[PDB]
Amino acid sequence: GLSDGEWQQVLNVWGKVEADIAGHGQEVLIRLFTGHPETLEKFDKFKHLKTEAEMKASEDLKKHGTVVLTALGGILKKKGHHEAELKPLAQSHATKHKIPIKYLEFISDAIIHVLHSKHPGDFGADAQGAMTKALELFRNDIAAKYKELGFQ
Numbered sequence: 001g002l003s004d005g006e007w008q009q010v011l012n013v014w015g016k017v018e019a020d021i022a023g024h025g026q027e028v029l030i031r032l033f034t035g036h037p038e039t040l041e042k043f044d045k046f047k048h049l050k051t052e053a054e055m056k057a058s059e060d061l062k063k064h065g066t067v068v069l070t071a072l073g074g075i076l077k078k079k080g081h082h083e084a085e086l087k088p089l090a091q092s093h094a095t096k097h098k099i100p101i102k103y104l105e106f107i108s109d110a111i112i113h114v115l116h117s118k119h120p121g122d123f124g125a126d127a128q129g130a131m132t133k134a135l136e137l138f139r140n141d142i143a144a145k146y147k148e149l150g151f152q
């Protein structure tokens with residue numbers, strides 16, 4: 001678990017994200033796709049994007065950034081009580097989208113980078129540690145669902 005103070009740090013920086021969810025989503029996906037190009041292959045509708053300029057110009061990529069961070073926001077706000085969300089998210093990422101756990105690690109690292117870049121005053125080491133723990137909790141719970149399904 002995270003402590004109450006850790007949860008408060010996590011949702012404090014998340015409130016900052018929510019002021020421009022779309023901008024944040026776009027930056028997170030760009031950081032992910034450029035840092036780990038294998039991740040881009042999982043998105044049929046983003047495969048044609050070959051440069052960071054092309055990604056930055058893609059309204060659909062920005063829209064999708066909004067979708068993914070909005071979903072994550074709802075999960076974070078459950079402060080670990082996220083079974084209703086995590087169960088179908090696991091099944092879809094394992095079965096429908098075929099997403100290795102390692103890629104969830106990659107996007108978590110991308111989120112940390114972006115939040116630190118944009119909100120350093122609300123994302124010092126302790127708050128970063130808290131966010132990292134929150135994302136690890138989520139990944140760890142999904143991993144259990146992956147194991148249940150026999151997805152590697």
Ligand SMILES: [C-]#N
Pocket residue numbers: 068
């Ligand atoms: C999901 N992105």
